[PDB]
Each structure stands twice: as structure tokens, then as C-alpha cells.
Ligand binder design. Structure first.
Ligand SMILES: CCn1cc(-c2ccnc(Nc3ccc(N4CCN(C5COC5)CC4)cc3)n2)c(-c2cccnc2)n1
Length: 295
């Protein structure tokens, strides 16, 4: 049962991460991620998280089950979750432009999901850093809010024991979105705060991607990924470090943005996610409060 109770209907994505399928469970739409054979530790970590923690939130991909199963005479690792037909924020930002209300809805939902991850709840969940946040890791829901997915690189911290749980995963984050301290390998790995600060850096990149797609003064930019103009597709590790650490570049913020009320708040936020000093960066909770106030 659990995975034998599921019919894989159509495969909506294939990539390094493996495969994502739309499928039926009880005649219900579910997402089914089938992990690539290279990536069993991400499956194990995510199964470990969603099983040992009460991790449920509007803006976090809703867990249904994890399972092992045979197909084509080989073991497959499955993670089954709610299904969101609109797909990834990354693909959404190419299929449409945004007004002010829908841009703010999107980024605030993301900040809310991320704050919920970052914040320990007592008697309950530990603090959780995501460590691979990106537009391709964020699902758009029918109601226009988003939810965060792909918890396989997650790190946890509990105040009761003061134990940092970094797990055992050789996988590293998407290179395009790696904060400088990850690229120049100076991140203080023993301090949980360092990982929250990595999620904030990545959140600023996503915030940048979204803001760009908001119409202001009747105009809008084509979708482009962070640093699209200084690194190739599938950027390499040294590709990113030279741009981020040596040149210390940031995605460009048009000056005009500071004449638009909404874009002004957004551009101020992103700049305070990109401080090269990780301790200078806003926290997720502060981002949520700020966006909650915007109009
Ligand atoms: C690869 C990123 N990931 C997306 C999902 C995920 C979770 C829940 N629901 C959905 N549904 C969905 C619907 C439509 C589309 N499409 C949109 C447009 N289409 C265009 C062709 O060019 C782009 C591409 C595909 C994609 C996904 N996906 C998951 C996942 C799944 C299970 C467990 N853990 C994570 N990982």
C-alpha cells in the first residue's frame, strides 16, 4: 500500500532531481516525486523530516506520504504530496506578468512559509533551514499564494538540547543561488544561524525575480534568472564565486524602482538580503512583517 495505491497519470517534469508525476490516490490528485538514484539521502532526509516533525503550513508543500516500491526491477524512492496544477513559480513567471496585489501575495506567502520553517515551535517543530531555496522549488497554488518544496538539504536546530542536526547529504545547493559564504566556503557550519542566512540570501534572489515581472508605469521586464547576464546556464562553482565573491555583484536594481511605492519597498528588502556580511541580513520574520505592511 501507500504507493501501490497510486496511479501515475502523467509525468510533468524530469531533471537532475529525478521525476515529478501527477498521480491519483483515492481518485485524488497528488504530486509524486521519484528520486534519482544518486539522491537517496535527499529522499531519506525529507522522509525523516516530514515523518518526525509536525510540519504543516499553508505555504509549505503539504506532505502525504513517502514510500519505497519496485518498478522495472529496481528500487524507486517516492515522496507523495499535495498536487498544485499551476506548477513552479519559475515557470509561472514566464507564463504571466503581475499586478501589485499578486506580486505582494506571492512574495509574502514565500516569506511566511520560510518564517514558519525558521521558527522553533514548542510543545511543535524544530527550527529548520531550507538550504536550496529557488523559484524552481516554489509551487504556485490556485489561490495565488505559493508554497515551499524540496526539504532534502534541510538542517534542524532545537533549543531544548541546543543540537544542530545537519544530516548526512553530499548534495549541495543550486549554484546560481549560493550565498557568498557558501561559495568562498567560509560559512560557519556549526552555527544554525548561518543556514538561515543562506536562505535569506536566496530569498532575495527570488524576490528580485518576482519584482521584475510586476507591471509598473505600464512596463515590465522579461523573466530572467538571477545573474543571467554574467554567468552561463548551468553556472559552475567557480563561475558563481568569481561573480559573487570576487566581483561581489548583485542583481541589478533599476533606479526607476525607487519612484514606485511598491518596488521601492521590494528593492529595499532585497538589498538587505544581499549584504555580503551574513549577520547584516534581515531575518525571515522581519521580511514577513515588512511585506505584511506593504500596499
Ligand atoms: C521539480 C520541482 N518540483 C515540483 C513539484 C510539485 C509538487 C506539487 N505539485 C506539482 N505540480 C506541477 C504542476 C505543473 C507543472 N508544470 C508547469 C508548466 N510546464 C511548462 C513546460 O515548461 C514549463 C512545466 C510543468 C509542474 C508541477 N509539482 C515537486 C515535488 C513533488 C513531490 C514531492 N516533492 C516535490 N518538485
Amino acid at each position: 500500500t501507500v504507493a501501490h495505491q497510486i496511479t501515475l497519470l502523467e509525468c510533468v517534469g524530469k531533471g537532475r532531481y529525478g521525476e515529478v508525476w501527477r498521480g491519483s490516490w483515492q481518485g485524488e490528485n497528488v504530486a509524486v516525486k521519484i528520486f534519482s538514484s544518486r539522491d537517496e539521502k535527499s529522499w531519506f532526509r525529507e522522509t525523516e523530516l516530514y515523518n518526525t516533525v509536525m510540519l504543516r503550513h499553508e505555504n509549505i508543500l503539504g506532505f502525504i506520504a513517502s514510500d519505497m516500491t519496485s518498478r522495472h526491477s529496481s528500487t524507486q524512492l517516492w515522496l507523495i504530496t499535495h498536487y498544485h496544477e499551476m506548477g513552479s513559480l519559475y515557470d509561472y513567471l514566464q507564463l504571466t506578468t503581475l499586478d501589485t496585489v499578486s506580486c505582494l501575495r506571492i512574495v509574502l506567502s514565500i516569506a511566511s512559509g520560510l518564517a514558519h520553517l525558521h521558527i522553533e515551535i514548542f510543545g511543535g517543530k524544530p527550527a529548520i533551514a531550507h538550504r536550496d531555496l529557488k523559484s524552481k522549488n516554489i509551487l504556485v497554488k490556485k489561490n495565488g499564494q505559493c508554497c515551499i518544496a524540496d526539504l532534502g538539504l534541510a538542517v534542524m536546530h532545537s533549543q531544548s538540547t541546543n543540537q544542530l542536526d545537519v544530516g548526512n547529504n553530499p548534495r549541495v545547493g543550486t549554484k546560481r543561488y549560493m550565498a557568498p559564504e557558501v561559495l568562498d566556503e567560509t560559512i560557519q557550519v556549526d552555527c544554525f544561524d548561518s543556514y538561515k542566512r543562506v536562505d535569506i540570501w536566496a530569498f532575495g534572489l527570488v524576490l528580485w525575480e518576482v519584482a521584475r515581472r510586476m507591471v509598473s508605469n505600464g512596463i515590465v521586464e522579461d523573466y530572467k534568472p538571477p545573474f543571467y547576464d554574467v554567468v552561463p546556464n548551468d553556472p559552475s562553482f567557480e563561475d558563481m564565486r568569481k561573480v559573487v565573491c570576487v566581483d561581489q555583484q548583485r542583481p541589478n536594481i533599476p533606479n526607476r524602482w525607487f519612484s514606485d511605492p511598491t518596488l521601492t519597498s521590494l528593492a529595499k528588502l532585497m538589498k538587505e538580503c544581499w549584504y555580503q556580511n551574513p549577520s547584516a541580513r534581515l531575518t525571515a520574520l522581519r521580511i514577513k512583517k515588512t511585506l505584511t505592511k506593504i500596499d
